């Protein structure tokens, strides 16, 4: 909203024609100022009248508007991703609902919002898993693909997690397999790569495919190190530990993987994840 006027200030100042000369077009001096502050978005025609006085090419304001809108939206995705990581779903639900409430036409961004809405509903208990999955699949079979090639895969990752955590381990696995297959093809966005491999390994672990699980976990660690990310690495070492214990590797290599998990937990002040860990080492 406020960039249009801000770039109108920048330019009219450098043009060399007065702010009250830009008044005598189609509006009071006031409207120019209210536009100047972003307060009022100018009407299509008034703007075209202003487009006569600072030079200037017309597509330069649309240019302006498009960067400001992509940044607006990118900033919102960033913010939403940020609360997901913090598990703040009541806030996610509210935020995305309010954005959808505007019902503005932008199919890909609306898909992003709905994905987040249905998942948050799910976490918040507003909706069954069966229902959440349905809704999520209606998204895949819009079969869109804008600027974000990964968005369907993200939506697929959610579908597989809900299945896996609700007992449907073979469906979830097949799905994780689909995703990895589409990632080998695309690229790159390796944090996600790591994340699907982490869930895949969990589901493999609960299906007693321990080597398979361990393979996937080593691979995810390897990727975590190549993109420099500690996002899931501590829990990758936790999972590595669990696999090496069900496969009965030397206590040494087992406890090793676990101290490392422990290191990341403290380093990352991940107190929930840290708790369980100190439990097991005595317990099991």
């Amino acid at each position: 909203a406020e960039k249009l006027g801000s770039e109108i200030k920048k330019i009219r100042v450098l043009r060399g024609l007065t702010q009250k000369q830009l008044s005598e077009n189609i509006c009071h001096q006031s409207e120019v100022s209210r536009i100047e502050s972003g307060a009022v978005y100018p009407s299509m025609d008034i703007l075209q009248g202003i487009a006569a006085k600072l030079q200037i090419p017309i597509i330069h304001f649309y240019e302006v508007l498009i960067y400001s809108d992509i940044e607006r939206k990118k900033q919102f995705k960033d913010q939403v991703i940020m609360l997901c990581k913090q598990k703040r779903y009541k806030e996610i639900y509210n935020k995305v609902w309010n954005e959808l409430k505007k019902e503005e036409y932008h199919p890909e961004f609306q898909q992003f919002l709905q994905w987040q809405y249905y998942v948050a509903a799910y976490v918040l208990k507003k909706v069954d898993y069966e229902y959440c999955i349905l809704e999520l699949k209606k998204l895949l079979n819009q079969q869109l693909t804008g600027i974000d090639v990964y968005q369907n895969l993200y939506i697929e990752n959610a579908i597989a997690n809900i299945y896996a955590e609700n007992g449907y381990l073979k469906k979830g696995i097949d799905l994780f397999e689909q995703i990895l297959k589409q990632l080998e093809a695309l690229h790159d966005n390796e944090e996600f790569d790591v994340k699907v491999r982490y869930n895949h390994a969990k589901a493999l672990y609960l299906d007693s495919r321990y080597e398979e699980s361990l393979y996937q976990v080593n691979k995810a660690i390897e990727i975590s190190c190549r993109i420099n990310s500690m996002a899931l690495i501590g829990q990758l070492y936790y999972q590595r530990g669990e696999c090496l214990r069900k496969l009965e590797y030397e206590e040494a290599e087992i406890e090793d993987a676990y101290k490392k998990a422990s290191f990341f937990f403290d380093i990352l002040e991940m107190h929930a994840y840290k708790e369980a860990l100190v439990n097991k080492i005595s317990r099991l």
Binding site: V119, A164, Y273
Partner: peptide, 5 residues
């Protein structure tokens, strides 16, 4: 631990 969204 939990699955990761």
């Amino acid at each position: 631990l939990p699955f990761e969204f």
